[PDB]
Design a protein around this ligand. Structure first.
Ligand code: FAD
Ligand code: NAP
Ligand code: U4F
Length: 256
């Protein structure tokens, strides 16, 4: 469903990322991993772009999008949002900050939502590809504070790759909250720069040794099935696909 709504707040995070907060319509229900298409008439009256909903649907009045400035439309959105914020804060208030009007269409599903019904999962993501796993990790927390054993997911192995140390800041609060509340060791968090994070989990360096990682995760969960969920570059997808076949892991072709 297509509805007018508003960017009611934004943050400016490292590597040119917008942390948009968007007013959630009453009708709009989503599941973690879902994306939507957004139109910003101030940027283009006719163009729709897709973004992962980086918030969990248990958060009640806003959706969140983490949009990285990589080209024309995302660059213009970044520059509109920067300038509007630079201005209203040079020119105090009198009002609240006005919403940027936008239309949203969705939500749209992804097979990543099947994590909640998996026994053992590997999440692998690179850069802003983290966004659906940000939604999903937050959901996994809310759901364990609600129905403690009602979920069949027993172990989440998380691997987040970045070229730039500063990119870890997008979700370091969330990764910290996971390291606080994870007494029962549901999660194995793994950050690779390709610590200074400030987590108990030490930031590793270089391209991960995926052959050794798969060998280990297979050994831990045999003779059970492991599901690999991947959001990132296609060169990495080809390698993860060969490795999923070698060790009998679930894979969805999402990379062309
Ligand atoms: C399901 C889904 C979820 C997504 N979730 C997110 C998300 O959460 N956050 C996020 O930031 N992004 C996300 N994206 C990506 C996104 O939707 C942007 O449209 C793209 O990220 C922004 O388009 P743009 O106009 O700003 O860039 P473009 O101007 O289209 O440029 C995009 C890239 O293509 C290159 N390019 C452009 N033209 C050419 C050319 N002629 N030759 C060669 N290379 C060219 C550019 O150099 C750049 O690397 C998602 C995409 C999908 C499908
Ligand atoms: N899953 C999908 O549907 C899909 C489809 C296409 C792309 N994407 C998007 O692509 C983004 C990243 O791709 P990009 O074009 O921006 O490339 P990129 O900048 O090269 O990717 C950024 C990160 O990926 C690592 N990486 C790249 N190729 C790798 C490989 N073969 N093996 C291991 N690590 C590798 C980089 O490490 P190095 O510094 O060593 O390069 C870096 O940490 C993600 O944010 C994702 O959202 C998603
Ligand atoms: O930055 C990207 C991105 C950049 C260029 C190309 C694709 C993406 C991207 C794609 C993506 N897909 C694309 C393929 C999909 C939905 C999941 O639709 C058909 C199979 O599954 N899911 C994504 C989630 C977060 C970020 C991104 C993405």
């Amino acid at each position: 469903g297509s509805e007018p709504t508003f960017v009611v707040n934004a943050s400016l995070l490292p590597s040119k990322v917008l942390g948009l907060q968007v007013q959630r319509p009453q009708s709009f229900n989503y599941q973690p991993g879902d994306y939507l298409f957004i139109k910003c008439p101030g940027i283009s009256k006719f163009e729709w772009h897709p973004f992962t909903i980086s918030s969990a649907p248990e958060m009640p009045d806003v959706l969140t999008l983490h949009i990285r400035a990589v080209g024309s439309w995302t660059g213009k959105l970044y520059q509109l949002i920067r300038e509007q914020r630079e201005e209203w804060i040079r020119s105090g208030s009198s009002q609240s900050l006005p919403g940027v009007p936008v239309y949203i269409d969705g939500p749209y599903g992804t097979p990543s939502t099947h994590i909640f019904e998996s026994k053992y999962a590997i999440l692998i993501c690179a850069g802003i590809g983290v966004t659906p796993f940000a939604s999903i990790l937050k959901s996994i927390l809310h759901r364990n504070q609600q129905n403690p054993a009602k979920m069949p997911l027993k172990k989440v192995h998380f691997y987040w790759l970045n070229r730039e140390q500063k990119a870890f800041e997008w979700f370091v609060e969330l990764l910290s909250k996971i390291e606080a509340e994870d007494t029962n060791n549901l999660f194995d968090l793994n950050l690779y720069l390709t610590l200074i994070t400030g987590l108990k989990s030490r930031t590793k360096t270089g391209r991960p040794d995926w052959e050794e990682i798969f060998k280990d995760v297979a050994k831990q969960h045999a003779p059970d099935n492991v599901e690999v969920f991947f959001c990132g570059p296609t060169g990495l997808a080809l390698q993860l696909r060969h490795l999923c076949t070698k060790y009998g892991f679930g894979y969805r072709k999402e990379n062309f």
